[PDB]
Design a binder for this molecule. Sequence first.
Ligand code: GNP
Ligand code: MG
Length: 169
Amino acid sequence: GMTEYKLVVVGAGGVGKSALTIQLIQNHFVDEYDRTIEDSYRKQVVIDGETCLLDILDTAGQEEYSAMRDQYMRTGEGFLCVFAINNTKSFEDIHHYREQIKRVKDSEDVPMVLVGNKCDLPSRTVDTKQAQDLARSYGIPFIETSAKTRQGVDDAFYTLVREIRKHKE
Ligand SMILES: Nc1nc2c(ncn2[C@@H]2O[C@H](COP(=O)(O)OP(=O)(O)NP(=O)(O)O)[C@@H](O)[C@H]2O)c(=O)[nH]1
Ligand SMILES: [Mg+2]
């Protein structure tokens, strides 16, 4: 049968977790206008020649909401850790999300991808090489994305699936 992947998108408020998830699943960019909440989004894709089902949990970046935190972190198979390249604080916050995940999973080897989003904007304060250097320290892939243009979006999620598959040997 088809394998399903429970992917969890985490990161600071406003970095574009929802917009990435909606661009991946629905192929359009949300900004000014209203939208209905779902929080869990599903998609069939072919990655490296194997069809699979993606189940994406789009988490809140507000720290005051975390009832599901140890929940959705416990049920997730891999994590997209998102910061925005114009938000130094959200890049600094990656450490805290990676530590939360490691604790909840009780593992030093959790499938994860570091995502630097909003790479269409000119106001960059996080250098690509600095984020690459951090991802190398963790041993995980780094991808730059734009939910506005779709640059990198498929690649970020598919790379996470490839990390889960590699882990599962
Ligand atoms: N220029 C640009 N703006 C983006 C990009 N991704 C998201 N945004 C904008 O940034 C804002 C925050 O995006 P949103 O997806 O709601 O962020 P979030 O991480 O889910 N927020 P929260 O943690 O509050 O749930 C929105 O105005 C959205 O249009 C991107 O790649 N480029
Ligand atoms: Mg959101």
